[PDB]
């Protein structure tokens, strides 16, 4: 019998912390939580182009807080850094204008939970849009195996110049037309068009 301790459950052990599904190896070294990220239900946007994704104003503003603060301080909209933080927390119109200015030409990696194959993560060009649900291009949906019954897709932010470089060149949505399983088109779904 194990050392039950309180009697409700066996006690954790030094080796138990280093083993299993919940162990360190498979839960805090190969898969980690990450800052500069978000999640929200996805809706269909047909007016988008193949390389575009719609980020709600709240999510876009919260993801890009450092960049929005730097832009606000540089444009004299906010006096100092702390005033810029107060302004972005308040949520005035100038903050959203700066956000519209700053997000452009900066990729974000949309990612769905199962991520069965390498097309599960695809870079996109963000685009501010009202509402609170991500707008996604219908063509790239079937690569994610993402229907619109109800589905949440995580958005991750490449920070370094190298990361956004890879997202611009490698992980782009428009350079992954062919599915790697057998080299056939996957970015032309068939439900409606």
């Amino acid at each position: 019998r194990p050392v039950t301790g309180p009697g409700n459950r066996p006690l954790k052990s030094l080796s138990d912390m280093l083993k299993g599904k919940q162990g360190r190896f498979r839960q805090n070294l190969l898969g980690k939580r990450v800052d500069y990220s978000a999640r929200s239900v996805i809706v269909v946007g047909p007016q988008l182009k193949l390389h575009q994704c719609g980020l709600p104003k709240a999510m876009a503003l919260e993801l890009f807080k450092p960049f929005v603060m730097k832009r606000l301080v540089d444009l004299n909209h906010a006096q100092n850094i702390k005033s810029a933080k107060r302004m972005v927390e308040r949520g005035r119109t100038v903050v959203y204008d700066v956000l519209e200015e700053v997000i452009a030409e900066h990729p974000v990696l949309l990612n769905r939970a199962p991520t069965l194959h390498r097309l599960g993560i695809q870079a996109f060009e963000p685009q501010l849009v009202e509402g609170k649900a991500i707008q996604i291009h219908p063509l790239v949906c079937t690569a994610f195996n993402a229907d619109f019954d109800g589905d949440q897709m995580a958005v991750h932010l490449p920070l370094s110049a190298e990361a956004q470089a890879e997202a611009r060149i490698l992980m782009l949505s428009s350079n992954n037309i062919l599915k790697p399983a057998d080299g056939r088109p996957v970015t032309m779904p068939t439900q409606d068009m």
């Binding site: 280093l18 162990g23 190969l30 490698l170 399983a181 057998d182 080299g183």
Partner: protein
């Protein structure tokens, strides 16, 4: 051929189509080790799994030394055994059976060379695949003289 055909017909029965190279790479991975038999001159144990490259190196060494080579037969083992019986214990430890590998690695006192991917994701270093390779990453950048002459 048998393995590729069997798995391909299993997949095709529904309608999906996977290219044969994807299967072939795994099938090569399974067939990598060889079971040593008649381990007389090679001086190591008989009847245990050994990598193909190590077997070739030992055979070349012993034939150069003049001793007759130790024979061996190819052995096919599942993916799980192949993954567990890997040089890098820090990758096998990350795999399903953490306790056993750690005990045998500690007893063997084997140093884990960081060549590989899963071990280089643990340490937080750059994976040696894609943009993380040495040859791609050592390049330096500078414009041409005519660009500076223009501006």
């Amino acid at each position: 051929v048998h393995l590729v055909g069997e798995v391909q017909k299993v997949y095709n029965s529904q309608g999906v189509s996977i290219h044969d190279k994807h299967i072939e790479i795994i099938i090569r991975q399974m067939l990598r080790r060889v079971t040593i038999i008649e381990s007389g001159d090679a001086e190591l144990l008989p009847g245990e799994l050994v990598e193909r490259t190590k077997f070739e190196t030992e055979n070349r060494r012993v034939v150069q030394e003049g001793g007759h080579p130790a024979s061996g037969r190819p052995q096919l083992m599942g993916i799980t055994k192949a993954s567990l019986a890997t040089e890098s214990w820090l990758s096998a430890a990350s795999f399903q059976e953490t306790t056993r590998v750690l005990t045998d690695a500690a007893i063997n006192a084997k140093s884990d060379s960081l060549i590989g991917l899963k071990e280089n994701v643990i340490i937080g270093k750059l994976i040696p695949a894609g943009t993380g390779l040495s040859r791609y990453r050592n390049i330096r950048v500078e414009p041409t003289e005519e660009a500076k002459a223009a501006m």
